[PDB]
C-alpha cells in the first residue's frame, strides 16, 4: 500500500507527462510549460545561468 500526502514543504518528486515534439525555423504556435504564444523558434547563443 502506497500513501500519498501533501504538506506545506516543497515537493521534491515532480514532473509532467510526455508532450508533442519540437519544430524550428517555421512560424508556429507554441506552448512551453503553459507559456502559450506564436512565433519563430531557433537555437540561440544566449548564456543562460
Amino acid at each position: 500500500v502506497l500513501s500519498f500526502e501533501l504538506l506545506h514543504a516543497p515537493a521534491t518528486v515532480c514532473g509532467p507527462k510526455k508532450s508533442t515534439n519540437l519544430v524550428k525555423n517555421k512560424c508556429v504556435n507554441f506552448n512551453f510549460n503553459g507559456l502559450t504564444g506564436t512565433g519563430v523558434l531557433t537555437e540561440s547563443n544566449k548564456k543562460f545561468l
Binding site: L7, H8, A9, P10, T12
Partner: protein, 36 residues
C-alpha cells in the same frame, strides 16, 4: 521532536543571503577568490 520539514542536497570568500520572505524561505549564494 515534532518534525515538519526535511531536505538533503582565507583567500576563499563565500557569500550568502537568507530570506524568510513570509511565503517560504529563500537561499542565494556566491564563492570568490580574494585578497587577504
Amino acid at each position: 521532536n515534532n518534525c515538519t520539514f526535511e531536505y538533503v542536497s582565507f583567500k576563499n570568500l563565500r557569500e550568502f543571503v537568507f530570506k524568510n520572505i513570509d511565503g517560504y524561505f529563500k537561499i542565494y549564494s556566491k564563492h570568490t577568490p580574494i585578497n587577504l
